[PDB]
């Protein structure tokens, strides 16, 4: 349950006097498979260094998320930059269907029966995140009584 | 009765050639909003009796003219 996996790696150029100087960007996601998910970014001239430096950032920066069994309690909508995502509990038939790149954060996060889809731009760096928050903002299926009661 | 219609007049200036409005209300079948939708009806009113702006009760009968298949039963109010 270490369980990590990268979503996307990408070249990017910097351009100076002597020429273009390229780099790489890794975008990873780690989770315990039981709550607690996090993503990190981190970039570096070589690829290994990049994916590497990324897991590390995803070690920290790892929030956790009030599941409700293998699934979500209620349906939720997340939205960062131009990414706008939606996912549903979906009383598992089998489920876990969703655009790879949030399959990733859903998978390692423990949910086992989501159906989701991403609207807006499908820029990973922003849907992962749009969903992390999406799961984050999602509130306690019991400790909403907590909220109310009094 | 078998059903009744309501509706205001709109035209009485014609020899029992009275025409009656029938304002219903209805959910737009695509955009949800409710809209006004009128139904003018050429109705028979023997001895021309109601006037424009009289609310009235109406009932479906057999044909009396290419255009008339209804006749009045009651009036309800006047001067608008």
């Amino acid at each position: 349950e270490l369980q990590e996996k990268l979503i996307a790696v990408n070249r990017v150029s910097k351009t100076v006097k002597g020429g273009r100087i390229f780099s790489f960007t890794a975008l990873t996601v780690v989770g315990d498979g039981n709550g607690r998910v996090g993503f990190g970014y981190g970039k570096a001239r070589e690829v290994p260094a990049a994916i590497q430096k990324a897991m590390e950032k995803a070690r920290r920066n790892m929030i956790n998320v009030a599941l409700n069994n293998g699934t979500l309690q209620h349906p939720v909508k997340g939205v960062h930059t131009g990414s706008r995502v939606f996912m549903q509990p979906a009383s598992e038939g089998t489920g876990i269907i969703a655009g790879g790149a949030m399959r990733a954060v859903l998978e390692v996060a423990g949910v086992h029966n989501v159906l989701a889809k991403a609207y807006g731009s499908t820029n990973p760096i922003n849907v992962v995140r749009a969903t992390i928050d999406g799961l984050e903002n999602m509130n306690s299926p019991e400790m909403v009584a907590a909220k109310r009661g009094k | 009765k078998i059903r009744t219609l309501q509706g205001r007049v709109v035209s009485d200036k014609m020899e029992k050639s009275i025409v009656v409005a029938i304002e219903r209300f209805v959910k737009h079948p695509i955009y949800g909003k409710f809209i006004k939708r009128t139904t003018k009806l050429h109705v028979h009113d023997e001895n021309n009796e109601c006037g424009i702006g009289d609310v009235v009760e109406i009932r479906e009968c057999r044909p009396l003219s290419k255009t008339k298949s209804w006749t009045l039963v009651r009036v309800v109010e006047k001067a608008v």
């Binding site: 209620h74 509990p89 109310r148 | 949800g32």
Partner: protein, 129 residues
Amino acid sequence: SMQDPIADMLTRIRNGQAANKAAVTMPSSKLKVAIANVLKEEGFIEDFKVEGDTKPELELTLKYFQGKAVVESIQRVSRPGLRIYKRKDELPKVMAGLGIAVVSTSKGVMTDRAARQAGLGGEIICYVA
């Protein structure tokens, strides 16, 4: 304008709440109250009050639980432009079950839970959670 006052209520909550504001007041109406009622009975507002007579003055006490406010979201649904009327089998349940839906019926402003039991339906004023 003042044309929809219920959205104005919904929003005075919504706003003051995000302003961490203790109370909040507004011109009252029969309607307004019957709702605040439900808000209270279901524990979203702290307690209301109508300090008026000729120029009535509905006044509400907002609650804050942890650090948050108790009202994570308050939207209008029906509105004078476009009125919504769901039957009963069609009554909408918010946040799965958590949170509520304020609905007016042939017998008073209730909650979707309540209305569902009542066995009836009506104009679904707004959603709260």
